[PDB]
């Protein structure tokens, strides 16, 4: 019943502005606090904004105190969040939470609902799509130690690209890696799978990457 | 500015094992500090609040306590769904909430080492202009796994990156895929490469290598 | 019964301000002259500032003649010190002191009445935690020598280290040493005990380092 | 700018003895100079203002006196508690009040050679990519110990520091803590570290040494 839905988000560059917003439901909205809190990967919670019931008190982090502003709608159950003049730094997930209290001043408790946080990304870089460089495996000197092949996917933009072997037939032995980002702008993945190596001279092995954003897909052969 | 220091990294342990969480501030902030915990892909929530008090729908399992100005999370007995990672944050009397890095929850395993492969760089990178070479680590327990590059028998560092894998669901294995990036130039003028994969599983450090 | 209480400081980031007070109790405050004087560690008296009674006239040490200023309230018995545009160079103990007289112009009298000094610290720095390395006994060629052991707590900003061995159960033949500054602005001290080289494989030797101003404990065994 | 000075550094007494303690200006300030004690961890005291008028509360073993342009204080018989840091003062018949550099007095004993021990860096430290070596001088008497650091039998300098404690309270006795930093990568450009102690109680230079 008790629920908070985040809206916005998306692929930005720096020194440009993004908006977010949350719908209340479940619950009466003006009744307590709200809050702003970020998670980059890799990084623990980073606390961003907050606004009291009636916005008595208004506090922002340092990092963002003179970018972002605080607001909430009570007519129509929402918090906003202005982000303004956009950095690489300022890349996380987002969320909204609701304060157990309607003012900060209370130290007795902690936060009570979260919602389902979206994505922020700020960098100078197009949806460019990813490319395909397969990694042919060591039959020569792995032939007894089980064969390893694989391929890298390399220069994409966005997060969410995709990677099955076989058109998603191979599942088993598969070992597919988060991507790393490259000081490029674009992100580069690897991705391996283990077979046994009396299958390599058999079985073909097709590397398949699906990318949507850039309406990208792309087919590699890994073979000794 | 005051931050908050949690464990080191991580805990090891086994399901039905005991497993202590604490967090102390470099500064006093509050009387009471609130425990939250997080799954991978999900928003975090709150178990603990006023130091001692349960949130509602929170199992028994989670205790409250604490000695001086050390807090601590105690779990009396580990379930498999209680791997996840914990955080602590204190209030200050203000809206800006301070946050831990938090703790994290791993299962426990027999130490063993991984299988090493290597994948030197494809035709279609040299032709780019580009060179990329593989070192991977297979099924090992421990998530510390280090490894080396070498070229042309020299160390090298700086031009590598690392990505692993988050604990198998079944095998409770990580695998580690380390990249070291060469211009076609660059790549062309060596004549040996090499990696060195060191362990804890490992009685001695594996080196492998290709022309 | 008579007394001067001082107050404030603390660290400040360079070009910063920083204000200090200082209470007078058990004496008439308007009967008297008031001055500021500060010691650096290591070095002397030096004089900043001074006040007549009545504020008649005032006077500044030229090293702060453009960055300090001093006033006091008369009825509210205190003195004040506004400290603009710190450098490091100001890192001293400030103190709060009586004159004597209430003329200034008076060569007869001189301080007979001395507060506490407080400590003022600026630094491009945060308060960064000790790291602790321990100090082996060359056992193999001191041993007819006596032993010393010893460890090191390095790069931590904060002056007040306390380190003491066996949770102050070893006290006899310590020798603690005074920190000495570094030029990336974090100190660093040593801490030795000798003890017969008899024991060093009999009692195991621990020295607890304690950093009250971030609530670090590290406790550090030392062996051969 | 008219300064004052006091003697150079410091003065050795036993209890019981005479300690002359003189300070001058390098030009007329005024008719009448101040002085002050001061101890360890505490606020300067006054001692004797208006040259000759001794302070309420202060022993009549502190007596002022002076000859030609420079002034003196003169204690009649030394006693345990009276050894401290004393200052001289001069106002300028303004708020610009001036001290002196400052003196000491220590506790008189005879000379005795320091014992001296090296300690080779830990491995955690290298592991932290730095080097450290500590030249440790204790219970020696003269203040004036002097430590230089060899590295591959060659003197080194600029790269070092040095600390010194307070005189024992019981063995009257001084400790000198010397440390030699080097970083990772130089460190292990060298074999043989070593440090050379000078002191007036050795009939030779004493050497310690590791490899």
């Known amino acids: 019943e008790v629920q908070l839905v985040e809206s916005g988000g998306g692929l930005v560059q720096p020194g440009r502005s993004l908006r977010l917003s949350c719908?209340?439901?479940?619950?009466?909205?003006?009744?307590?606090?709200?809050?702003?809190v970020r998670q980059a990967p890799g990084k623990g919670l980073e606390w961003?904004?907050?606004?009291?019931?009636?916005?008595?008190?208004?506090?922002?982090?340092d990092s963002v105190k003179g970018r972002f502003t605080i607001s909430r709608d009570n007519a129509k159950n929402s918090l906003y969040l202005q982000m303004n003049s956009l950095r690489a730094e300022d890349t996380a997930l987002?969320?909204?939470?609701?304060?157990?209290?309607?003012?900060?001043?209370?130290?007795?408790?902690?936060?009570?609902?979260?919602?389902?946080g979206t994505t922020v990304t700020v960098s100078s870089a197009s949806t460019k799509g990813p490319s395909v460089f397969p990694l042919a495996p060591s039959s020569k000197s792995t032939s007894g130690g089980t064969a390893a092949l694989g391929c890298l996917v390399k220069d994409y933009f966005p997060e969410p690209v995709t990677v099955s072997w076989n058109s998603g037939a191979l599942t088993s032995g598969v070992h597919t890696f988060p991507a790393v980002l490259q000081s490029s702008g674009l992100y580069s993945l690897s991705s391996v799978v283990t077979v046994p190596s009396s299958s390599l001279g058999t079985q073909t092995y097709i590397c398949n990457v699906n990318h949507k954003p850039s309406n990208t897909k792309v087919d590699k052969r890994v073979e000794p | 500015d005051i931050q908050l220091t949690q464990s080191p990294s991580s805990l090891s342990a086994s399901v039905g094992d005991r497993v202590t969480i604490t967090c102390?501030?470099?500064?006093?902030?509050?009387?009471?500090?609130?425990?939250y915990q997080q799954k991978p892909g999900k928003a975090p929530k709150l178990?603990?609040?006023?130091?001692?008090?349960?949130?509602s729908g929170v199992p028994s399992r989670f205790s409250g306590s604490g000695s001086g100005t050390d807090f601590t999370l105690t779990i009396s007995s580990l379930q498999p769904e209680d791997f996840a990672t914990?955080?602590?944050?204190?209030?200050?009397?203000?809206?800006?909430?301070?946050?831990?890095?938090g703790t994290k929850v791993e299962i426990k395993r027999t130490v063993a080492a991984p299988s090493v492969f290597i994948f030197p760089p494809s035709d279609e990178q040299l032709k780019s202009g580009t060179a990329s070479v593989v070192c991977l680590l297979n099924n090992f327990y421990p998530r510390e796994a280090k490894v080396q590059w070498k070229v042309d028998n020299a160390l090298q560092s700086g031009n590598s990156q690392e990505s692993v894998t988050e604990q198998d669901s079944k095998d409770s294995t990580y695998s580690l895929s380390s990249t070291l990036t060469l211009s076609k130039a660059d790549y062309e003028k060596h004549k040996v490469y090499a990696c060195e994969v060191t362990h804890q599983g490992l009685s001695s450090p594996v080196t492998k290598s290709f022309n | 019964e008579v007394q001067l209480v001082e107050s404030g400081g603390g660290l400040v980031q360079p070009g910063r301000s920083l204000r200090l007070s200082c209470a007078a109790s058990?004496?008439?405050?308007?009967?008297?002259?008031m001055h500021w004087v500060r010691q650096a560690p290591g070095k002397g008296l030096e004089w900043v500032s001074g006040?007549?009674?009545?504020?008649?006239?005032?006077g500044y040490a030229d090293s702060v003649k453009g960055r300090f200023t001093i006033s006091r309230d008369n009825a509210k018995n205190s003195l004040y010190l506004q400290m603009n545009s710190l450098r490091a160079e100001d890192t001293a103990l400030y103190y709060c002191?009586?004159?004597?007289?209430?003329?200034?112009?008076?060569?007869?009298?001189?301080?007979?009445?001395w507060g506490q000094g407080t400590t003022v610290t600026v630094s491009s720095a945060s308060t960064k935690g000790p790291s602790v390395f321990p100090l082996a006994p060359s056992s193999k060629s001191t041993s007819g020598g006596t032993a010393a052991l010893g460890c090191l707590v390095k790069d931590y900003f904060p002056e007040p280290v306390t380190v003491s061995w066996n949770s102050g159960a070893l006290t006899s033949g310590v020798h603690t040493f005074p920190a000495v500054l570094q030029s990336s602005g974090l100190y660093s001290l040593s801490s030795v005990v000798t003890v017969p080289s008899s024991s060093l494989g009999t009692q195991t030797y621990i020295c607890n380092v304690n950093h009250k101003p971030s609530n670090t404990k590290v406790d550090k065994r030392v062996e051969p | 700018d008219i300064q004052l000075t006091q003697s150079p550094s410091s003065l050795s007494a036993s209890v019981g003895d005479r300690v002359t303690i003189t300070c001058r200006a390098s030009?007329?300030?005024?008719?009448?100079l101040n002085w002050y004690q001061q101890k360890p961890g505490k606020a300067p005291k006054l001692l004797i203002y208006?040259?000759?008028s001794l302070q309420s509360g202060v022993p009549s073993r502190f007596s002022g006196s002076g000859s030609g342009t420079d002034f003196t204080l003169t204690i009649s018989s030394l006693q345990p508690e009276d050894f401290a840091t004393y200052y001289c003062?001069?106002?300028?018949?303004?708020?610009?009040?001036?001290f002196g550099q400052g003196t000491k007095v220590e506790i008189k004993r005879t000379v005795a050679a320091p014992s001296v021990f090296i300690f080779p860096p830990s491995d955690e430290q290298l592991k932290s990519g730095t080097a450290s070596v500590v030249c440790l001088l204790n219970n020696f008497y003269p203040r004036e110990a002097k430590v230089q650091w060899k590295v591959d039998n060659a003197l080194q300098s600029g790269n070092s520091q040095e600390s010194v404690t307070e005189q024992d309270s019981k063995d009257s006795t001084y400790s000198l803590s010397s440390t030699l930093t080097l970083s990772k990568a130089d460190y292990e450009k060298h074999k043989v570290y070593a440090c050379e102690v000078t002191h007036q109680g050795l009939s030779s230079p004493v050497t310690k040494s590791f490899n």
């Open positions: 030009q007329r300030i005024s008719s009448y």
């Open positions: 208006g040259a000759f």
């Open positions: 002191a009586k004159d004597m007289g209430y003329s200034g112009n008076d060569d007869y009298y001189g301080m007979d009445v």
């Open positions: 003062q001069q106002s300028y018949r303004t708020l610009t009040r001036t």
């Open positions: 006040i007549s009674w009545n504020s008649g006239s005032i």
């Open positions: 058990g004496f008439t405050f308007d009967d008297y002259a």
